[PDB]
Structure formats: structure tokens, C-alpha cells
Amino acid sequence: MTPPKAEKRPYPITTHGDTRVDDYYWLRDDERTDPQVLDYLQAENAFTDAALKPQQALRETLYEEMVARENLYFQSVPYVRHGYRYQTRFEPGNEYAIYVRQPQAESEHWDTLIDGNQRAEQREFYTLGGLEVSPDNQKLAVAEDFLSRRQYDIRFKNLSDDSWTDEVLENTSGSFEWANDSATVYYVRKHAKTLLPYQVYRHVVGTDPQLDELIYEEQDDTFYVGLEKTTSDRFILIHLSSTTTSEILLLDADRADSTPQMFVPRRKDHEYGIDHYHQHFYIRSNKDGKNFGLYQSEQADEAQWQTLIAPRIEVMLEGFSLFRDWLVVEERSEGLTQLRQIHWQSGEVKRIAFDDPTYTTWLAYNPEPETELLRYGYSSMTTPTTLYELNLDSDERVMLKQQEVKNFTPENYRSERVWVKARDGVEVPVSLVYRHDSFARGTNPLMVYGYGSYGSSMDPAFSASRLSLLDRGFVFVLAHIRGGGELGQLWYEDGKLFKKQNTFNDFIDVTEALIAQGYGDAKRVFAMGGAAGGLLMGAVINQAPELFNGIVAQVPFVDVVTTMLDESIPLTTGEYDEWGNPNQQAYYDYILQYSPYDQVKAQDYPHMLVTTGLHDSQVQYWEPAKWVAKLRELKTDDRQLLLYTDMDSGHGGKSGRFKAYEDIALEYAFILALAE
């Protein structure tokens, strides 16, 4: 079958006297209306449909077995907050969650707080982006998106009679806090054009939003504006943060006329976050070390901050929770997540021990500090996600919930942590899982998954959908490459800006070691990654095409120089601290060397499926479309190259989780057919 051939319209882009001619610059159409652009995306979708037509039966088998291992009756673990018990309920044949509550001393009767199915009646789209009852338990504030544009309407329900007030706060981030009067709420307004959060307003419930007062306006575009409330309830925080740099303003939660009080003025490369409890500020801050410390203060002044935990090169400090008698910290060390608890009085330290080679642990939702019971999450490549509750004093651990997986026997699978010595001598961790009875050294197809940007960690956890590959002989690998966070801030920093190439080198060095050690069949190595992990997919296949049989590149960031030169593209002005600004000759040069679109060569490429989405305003559909067009023009092999563009507008990843399972089934069928 003859693949679609995009029209070439040579478009020169000249930077620092370097001219790049982009034949497909025209595929970018911000209005997503141009019929010629739509024609190319439709033709590629038709080609993908026709190429993958024989995989239909396998797609059905995969889809049905993925849905079959999940319950359709889900009920959350109930939690208590301000004398009420809260539960979320999904029943089969309901797109949306029902949220219920009852008085804490009640068992029998539950009251509906909000039914998403009911709220979605006569609407094209529904996302709940926020839910919070007032301190006096009388009012519900909800942040809802009916239009799919990530702009939230805040509305108010009287819980006494289930009546709604008739005002709406429009174009909000969904971030809002009640003042302690259960009458005033603070909310974040998004910029009209950029949709970036930039204003804090104050609303009296029951009044017209025209009466609302502007409390704070952020001048720096790169600074996210979010609202928080301290554990003590004494302060509403205006949390301002770039990727590198923080600033917190305090709002007295106990007055109706409060103005923002500076905590510590922003200083480039000083990231901090605060809470308030027991008459102290608690600060997680990188002021003295990239791996962060914890500080106590009676006042804002940075020089008064007292050190509770000093930053350590070996231990990244990720977060903390405050309880009556205990401090609990989330840390990473030697490539594992950990929890430690420290007694406020005795200074007694306990670590929460797990022996699984490939697990992750985290602080879960603990809305009440007056307790000895900690809720924390656990998952491994062999153990479905678990909520535990720990008695911090007695060390008694109970299981509150497990992820229910049907047709699944945990003993059928093995997992391992492998360390690979990268080409520059740096040790890269790897987490891998496979079915015991079908494993034979050098025989198995290998799926290598990476991300490797922003300090995001691909922490090893359980996947139900992954069983569809493991039960078909695949060794599934997480490559914990530089640019991720698995070994702390230095791990991230050694895979961004002028070290970004280490991300792609680590992925190739990991893949080569695994093949050398017989984890996979050299001829049946597959890889997948999405977004900045699609950047990884693009760079790896330019640099080392021969390693991989097949590739899935989801919504890939591939036109890196051109996108990062254009502040009109959503996200660009917030990403200079990740890739660099190619307006500077040093960054242009460094970035162009890996920018996958720019490094497409007349060479043999793996089989590849590239995905994207038309109407998702923060998915830049043109980048993978241009990339596929250029690959079609230059590649020397006869292997399959497909572009699938989601033409939808709605549902996304939840409720249309069936859409999510459909995409997984398509992608896994594509790979399984190549590995057969």
C-alpha cells in the first residue's frame, strides 16, 4: 500500500545565520480548521486503519482481557475530615464517580455530595477539577469543566437542602480555599489568552462575581499560582513557583479583609514550600543543598530557619506530613523510595522497611494531624497498589485496600533491580518484570519504557494492562535514565539543559546491557515513551536505529529547536529551564544535535507507531505529523511507519478509560504482531 505523502512547502528558519528548511512547517494550524492539514492527518489515519486491519481480533482479545481483570464496582477507602466520612463510588454503567459522605459517628446512611453523572446530564463534557466542603460543613465548593478546555467553573451547593447558589466563578485553575468563616473563598483566575494561572480573587458566597476583589497578580508568566491551606488552618498560602524558584505569600484565614504577607522573597534556584502547625512554620527548602532540607521557623525570615533535616548528597527529600507526635518524610535513596518518621519530643527515628527489589512507597492522603495513624501507598511490579495504615507509635501496619486484579496470580511473575554501568561510568538503575514459566535467557521479547525529563521518576509500580505483555513472554523494563528523578536532583540535572544527551545515552546503554545479559532476544527489542519520553523515542531511533525491532512514540516532542524558538506555542515560555533557550547560540547548537525532527537521516528505522491528538490544545499535533512526513521522505527501510491522530474532543483517560484501554490495545497489538 502506498503511504500518504504530505505536500512539501519549503519553509526556511534562520537562527544565528543557520538556515533549516522545514518542508512541513505548514502542518501547524493553531485553529485546527485548515482542510489541507486535516486531509494529511485523515489520510495517515486511513493508512494506519488499513495497515492494522489484520490486528483487529488481537485488539479485541487484548481489550476484553484488560477490562476483565478490573472490577467495575469501585469504592474508595473512606477518610474522615472535620467530623464527616467521605467515599467515592463508581457503579457499572456510570461514566462518573458519585461522592458521598456521612457524619463520622454515623454508619448506616450516606448522603450524596455530588453525582458526576447527574452534573454531566445534557453536557458534551464533564471533568470534576476540585471538591471541598466549608469548615462549618454547610457548603460544597466544586470546580467543574463542561467544555474540555481545562478552564474550571466554581459553583456552591448548600448541603442543608441540596440547593445551589446561582453565581459561577469562570476561567479558574480549580485551585480554591475556604477562609475559616465558611463564607469567603480565594480562587485562582487563568490569563484570557495563555490560560496560565496569574490572579488570586476573593469571593463572598451568594454575591455576584463582579463584587470579587483582586488579592494578588503574578507579574512573571513562568510562575505558577496555586492556593493551599496550612494544617493549622491559620493561613491560606499563595504558592508561586517556576520550575526552579518559589515564593509564598500568607493570607490570614481568620479575617475577611486579609492582604498577602511576604514569606521569603523569590531568589532564582531557591525552591521552598511551607506548612504551619504547633505554632511553627515547617519549610522544605533547597537553600543549602540540591537534595533539600527540612526547617522549622517562628517567622518568615530565612536566617531564623532552624535545621530539622540537613540536605544530604545520598538522600533526596521529596515531601513531609505533620502529625501530633511525629514528622513523616518521603525520601529517595540508592534508587528506592522510603518513608522515615521522627518523634517531635524523643527524636526517635523509624524507617518503613520494604524488601521488594522494585517497589515505590509514598505519603497518601492524611487530612487530620491529630492521630498516630499514617496512611501510605505501596506498589511493586509484582504487588498491586495497596493502601496501608501504620500506627506510628506501635508500628502495627494494616492493609486498608488493594487494587483488585482478576485472572492474576502474583507468584507467576519475578522482578529484579539491575544496575547498568553507562558509557561515562555512571551507574543507571533498571527495574524489570517477567512471567517465570515462559522466561528463557536470550529468548524473550523485551519492552523498554523510558521518560527521563523534568525530574519525574518512572518509579516501579504494578500495572494490570502490563500483564497482557508479560503473559505473552515479554520482559518489561523501566529504564531509570538521567533526566528523571530516581537518584535525586543531581540525576535530573545530569539529564537536562547542556546534559540532555545523557538521557538518550542511558536508554541505549541500558538496552545494550540487557541484551548482553540475555534478558531479551536481540532481534525482538521494543521501546515506548510518551511526550518528553517521545523525545527519548525520537533521539534513540536517530542515534541507534538497529537496536530496536519496533517503537511506540506517544504525542512525541520532536520539533524541539523550532518549538523552543516560538513563544506563541503553548508551554514554550515555561520550558526554557528544561531544554534551554535556542535564542542563545550555545543552546541552539546543543539542542539541534538531538532535536529528533532535525536529525532524521537517510537510514533504516525500526517499525514505529506514532500517536497524537488534534483537539487537545496542549498536545502539539503537528510535531509528530511533520516527523512522520519527513521519515517517509528520508528513511531507507520498508518497515511499517504509522501515524494515528485522535480526532475526538472528549472523555480522555477516565470514564473514557475505555478510550484509554482502546489505545493500549492498539499499541500492544502493533508490538505483539511484530514480536509474534
Numbering used by the authors: 2 to 677
Give sentences copied directly from the paper behind this entry.
Despite its small effect on thermal stability, the presence of Sp made it possible to obtain crystals suitable for X-ray analysis for PSPmod and its derivatives, PSPmodE125A and PSPmodS532A. PSPmodS532A carried the alanine substitution of the catalytic triad serine and did not possess any enzymatic activity. PSPmod and two its derivatives (PSPmodE125A and PSPmodS532A) were crystallized in intermediate conformations, which are characterized by a disruption of the catalytic triad typical for ligand-free enzymes in open states, while domains’ closeness resembled closed states of ligand-bound POP. In the PSPmod structure, the distances between Cα-atoms in the pairs Ser532–His652 and His652–Asp617 are equal to 18.2 and 10.6 Å, respectively, which are longer than those in the closed states of TbOpB and ApPEP and comparable with those in the open state of TbOpB and intermediate states of PfPEP and GmPEP. Similar distances are observed in the structures of PSPmod derivatives. As a result, five, three and two bound Sp molecules were found in the structures of PSPmod, PSPmodE125A and PSPmodS532A, respectively. Sp701 is present in all structures, while Sp704—only in the PSPmod structure. The second Sp of the PSPmodS532A structure is in the proximity of catalytic Ser532 similarly to Sp703 in the PSP structure.
Oligopeptidase B (OpB) is a two-domain, trypsin-like serine peptidase belonging to the S9 prolyloligopeptidase (POP) family. Two domains are linked by a hinge region that participates in the transition of the enzyme between two major states—closed and open—in which domains and residues of the catalytic triad are located close to each other and separated, respectively. In this study, we described for the first time the structures of bacterial OpB from S. proteomaculans (PSP) obtained by X-ray for an enzyme with a modified hinge region (PSPmod) and two of its derivatives. The enzymes were crystallized in the presence of spermine and adopted uncommon intermediate states in the crystal lattices.
